[PDB]
Design a protein around this ligand. Structure first.
Ligand SMILES: COc1ccc(C(=O)NO)cc1NC(=O)c1ccc(-c2ccccc2)cc1
Ligand SMILES: [K+]
Ligand SMILES: [K+]
Ligand SMILES: [Zn+2]
Length: 386
């Protein structure tokens, strides 16, 4: 089936943070308003039988001391008694500050997306679902011992780690505006997890990686050549982004032959995102995201589709509703007819002023990157005997 991760507690926790507020509820209530929910298998988030099991699951990637620091931070924020100098030092040493501050549910909230993405991986492994969607997941910046970019725990690394430890090769495809640095770094030394991030990069722009360093770094040890990056200039539209990524994705699939694909589908590339870096749409006559996802799904590899960035909440929901409907279509083979008009539902008023499903927008560097990447794909294949 097509799985989708949700649940009452999961929804409350994914909506408990100060940065993303109720985005996740808008997403899942828009998916429900368009009657897509009866087509999807509900995947419940994973729960553990003990603190020790939860700890062993999260410290498959993250360090125990970082995990202890994040739990203590939540408890500290469940008081209003502010931090001591020593606790602030401790939090600072894990970048639990500034862009990644504490708040009352920060650990539970962070853990929720891990529980979601680890259940998603399990449903794929156990053959329940061909494709599973977790729009509460996709926190690709978190590191082993460091919060970054409002990612506190890296649910993607953990889910990929569960997939590979089920020769299993995973292709990770990161469509977010921002370089997927935490997932790339986790698998820097790992040939069986090939990472491919397309993103904006430019001087001063978060997080700073995924571009020249001058040449591209692309892995080390047996991981050499297994990390792929396509940084694009600001202002790119659906068709130019589509032509830049499409032959790369296609080559990646032909050569790597992945057992699973993991797709981070962060919506901040939309023309209407407050970033206003990329000019991508959710249009489906074509949306760069719908093109890439449909391509990836035409491969017929079991596939995890995850959320990510997206700071125009109603437009993230318009995009992910369409991704969700496309997936149902490309997997079950049954047409989904979406009204161009948003249906009445609890968040209907958020879709002003037009209440249409389409976002309210009027729409050789790449060839050099293509030859670089195609040569890097050559080295990976010869290095790995494919
Ligand atoms: C630099 O920090 C980041 C770190 C990581 C990410 C991310 O998604 N990575 O994958 C994004 C940001 N940018 C913002 O936080 C941001 C900026 C601006 C807005 C905004 C929202 C509403 C109106 C205007 C601006 C919202 C969020
Ligand atoms: K990206
Ligand atoms: K790798
Ligand atoms: Zn982003």
């Amino acid at each position: 089936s097509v799985g989708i991760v949700y649940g009452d507690q999961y929804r409350q926790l994914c909506c408990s943070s100060p940065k993303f507020g109720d985005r996740y509820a808008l997403v899942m209530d828009l998916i429900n308003a368009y009657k897509l929910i009866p087509e999807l298998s509900r995947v419940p988030p994973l729960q553990w039988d003990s603190p020790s099991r939860m700890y062993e699951a999260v410290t498959a990637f993250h360090s125990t001391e970082y995990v202890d620091a994040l739990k203590k931070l939540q408890m500290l924020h469940c008081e209003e008694k502010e931090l001591t100098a020593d606790d602030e030092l401790l939090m600072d040493s894990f970048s639990l500050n500034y862009d990644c501050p504490g708040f009352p549910s920060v650990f539970d909230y962070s853990l929720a997306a891990v529980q979601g993405s680890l259940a998603a991986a399990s449903a794929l492994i156990c053959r329940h679902c061909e494709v599973v969607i977790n729009w509460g997941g996709g926190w690709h910046h978190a590191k082993r011992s460091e919060a970054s970019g409002f990612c506190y725990l890296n649910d993607i690394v953990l889910a990929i780690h569960r997939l590979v430890s089920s020769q299993t090769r995973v292709l990770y495809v990161d469509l977010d505006l921002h370089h997927g640095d935490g997932v790339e770094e986790a698998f820097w030394y790992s040939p069986r997890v090939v990472t491919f991030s397309v993103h904006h990069a430019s001087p001063g722009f978060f997080p700073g990686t995924g571009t020249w360093n001058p040449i591209f770094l692309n892995g080390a040890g047996r991981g050499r050549f297994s990390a792929f990056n396509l940084p694009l200039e600001e202002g790119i539209n659906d068709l130019d982004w589509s032509n830049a990524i499409g032959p790369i994705l296609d080559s990646l699939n032909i050569v790597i032959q992945p057992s699973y694909v993991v797709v981070q589908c962060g919506a901040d590339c939309l023309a209407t995102d407050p970033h206003r870096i990329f000019r991508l749409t959710n249009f489906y006559p074509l949306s760069g995201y719908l093109y890439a996802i449909k391509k990836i799904l035409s491969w017929k590899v079991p596939t995890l589709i995850l959320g990510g960035g997206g700071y125009n909440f109603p437009d993230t929901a318009r995009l992910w509703t369409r991704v969700t409907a496309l997936t149902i279509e490309e997997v079950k083979g049954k047409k989904m007819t979406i009204s161009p008009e948003i249906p009445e539902h609890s968040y209907f008023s958020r879709y002003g002023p037009d209440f249409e499903l389409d976002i309210d927008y009027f729409p050789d560097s790449i060839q050099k990157h293509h030859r670089r990447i195609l040569e890097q794909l050559r080295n990976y294949a010869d290095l790995n005997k494919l």
